[PDB]
Structure formats: C-alpha cells, structure tokens
C-alpha cells in the first residue's frame, strides 16, 4: 500500500528527471573569460567511479559579449573503435540552458600530447549541425599508437561551436568567429593524476580548425587510466539498496507497458499525455537520448536505475518531492483527495479498485481528514 505510493512516486520523479537532465558543464563568466566546471568522473569496469574535477577557461580572440552563468547538457558517445583504439568514432549532442557558422559545418582537429611520458599525435575530422546540437568525429592516432591509457581521458578534448544556445543566452563560442577562441583546461583525478590541455579554435576556408596540446602526468601505472579500466564519463551516483531496485523495477513496469525491457518515446509519451502534459515528439526523443547511456537507441532498466541513482543535493531532492506532489495534487489546493489519487494512478497505468484507493488514502492520512497534504505525502516517499 505504501509500496503503491512509492511505485507511483518514483514514476512521477522519473518523469521529472527525464525532463531535467544532470548538468554536464557549468558555465560562469569570470575575469573577462568564460569559465566552466565539470564534476563528472569516469565509470570503471568494476562499476565504481573514478572522480575527476575539470576546470576550463575559454577566451575569445576578439572582445565578445560574455553571458551570465548557465548550464550545458552534453552526451558524448563512443560510436565505434578498432581493437587497439587507434581509430575512434565519437559523437555528441550539447545544449545550453539556464552566416559564417552555417547550418552544417565540418572541422579538422590535430592533437599532440603526452601521458606519463608517452608521446602521441592524433588527427581527426568531424562534422555536425552547430545550432541543432549534433556532432561526430573520426580520430586516428598517427603517432605513438596504440595508446597505453584510457581513451576517455582524450574524448572531451576533441568542439564548443556545436552547442545549441537559446536566443536569450549569448553564444560566446559562435560569436567569437571568424577569429575564434582558445581554451585551457586542468583535470585532477582522484588518484592524483593530472592533465593540462591547451586548445585553439579557428575558422579557415569555411572549416573549423582545432589544435590541441595535452600533457598528462602522475597517473599510477596500475591505476585505472593507465590500465584501460574505464568506460566513459558519468555523474556521481548514490548506491541503491535491494529494496530500492525492487521499487524502481515496479516504477519501470508502468512505463514499459508491452514488457519488452525497454521504454520508448511512445510509452513515455503515453504516460505523459495521460498526466495531462504534452511534450513534443522532438522533446520525448531528447529525453530518451540523454539517458540512453550505451547509445544503442533504447532506454532499458539498468539505464533507468542510473537515472534514479543520480546524486542530488538536498535543495534539489526536496524540490523534486514538491514537484511530485504537485502532479498528484491536480487542482493545486494542497490536498490530494481520493479522486485526484485514483486519476493519477490510472494515468500511470495502475488500474485500482475503490477500496485500494481508500487504503492508500487511509495509510497516508496521518490527521484523518480523508486527504493527503504535503507533509503526509513526504512521510510516504
Ligand atoms: Ca516497452
Ligand atoms: Ca540503451
Ligand atoms: Ca487537491
Ligand atoms: Ca490528511
């Protein structure tokens, strides 16, 4: 009965999270530069997390309007690679939230660097849609291959022009062209490994030209970077208990109505329209892209668990519970009545009997007025 409340509450919070993806890069103006922080670290093959801190300074080559502080969601995937990673394909979509850069742009990149004293060069070519929010690139190790460390340390080094910015957030990167921009970056990792990166971005002949210089040092030789034990960048996650996994499985089942192990944009659209929302099919698609961790073009249960485990501060946990309450509290009068509850459960796809609805109210109603107020809801969730 309490389980029924948690099933429903988790599903509504899932919709909330699907509609609000973790920040990837936090942007902030400072000292005449646009700076950023990234708190994502690296998922290890053993399931653990290898923490990183990444600080970047971006600086246009001519004076350009700085924006106010904002957020970039970025999803980067390794689309393919040869056996030893000397040739790699990656792709990414990026979006900012609170004439010469054409609709379609190609780029060329050249990296030279060193990690624990291992010198290498990479040459690459990419393309995408700078306003739409999409890019792909093919990278090839031209010297020092095969690389004796995780590709993941290089992937975020290879394209800021390809970030969709809304109209009221100045696009520092796009506005800097044709002359372009430089960046500098420092990454610290939890075992003391360090990487300094310098980048130059310009526009020649209609093509973006990227130059990168990277120097990594102090990685332990048995550590996960030098032993290739990493699997992509991920945000910090909480550990889930066995019970929670059970709960979240039930919440998942309300979306996956056909039972195929996968949630689709159709299945998600269906629950979201019953709930009275109407997101556009571009939007439903974006929502699944952001949580499709393996990039196989489906949203499955382990990926649903990842979303539900993302580490969130207490302001933010509390806001999401407030938000869940507002969905159940259809009229917004601060009380969930029987009829409001029945309708939300039906909307979620839990068909319930009158008496089951009564027991749900009965178990949540501390003060006995026949409705559930916010404090009583919190107690449930
Ligand atoms: Ca399904
Ligand atoms: Ca997937
Ligand atoms: Ca109400
Ligand atoms: Ca009550």
Author numbering: 39 to 136, 163 to 222, 226 to 448
Show sentences the authors wrote.
To aid our protein engineering efforts, we sought to solve the crystal structures of mRuby, RCaMP, and R-GECO1.
In addition to mRuby and RCaMP, we also crystallized R-GECO1 in the presence of Ca2+ and solved the crystal structure to 2.2 Å by molecular replacement. Many of the mutations incorporated into the R-GECO1 sensor during initial screening and selection are concentrated at the proto-interface between mApple and CaM, as is the case for RCaMP. Three residues of the M13pep-cp-mApple linker (Val60, Val61, and Ser62) make hydrophobic and hydrogen-bonding contacts with CaM, cp-mApple, and the rest of the linker. Similar to GCaMP, the cp-mApple-CaM linker is not in close proximity to the chromophore, and no cp-mApple-CaM linker mutations were selected in R-GECO1. In addition to the linkers, R-GECO1 mutations Gly79, Arg81, Cys129, Phe366, and Asn380 are in the vicinity of the proto-interface. For R-GECO1, no backbone cleavage could be detected in the crystal structure, however, during SDS-PAGE, a similar fragmentation as for RCaMP is visible.
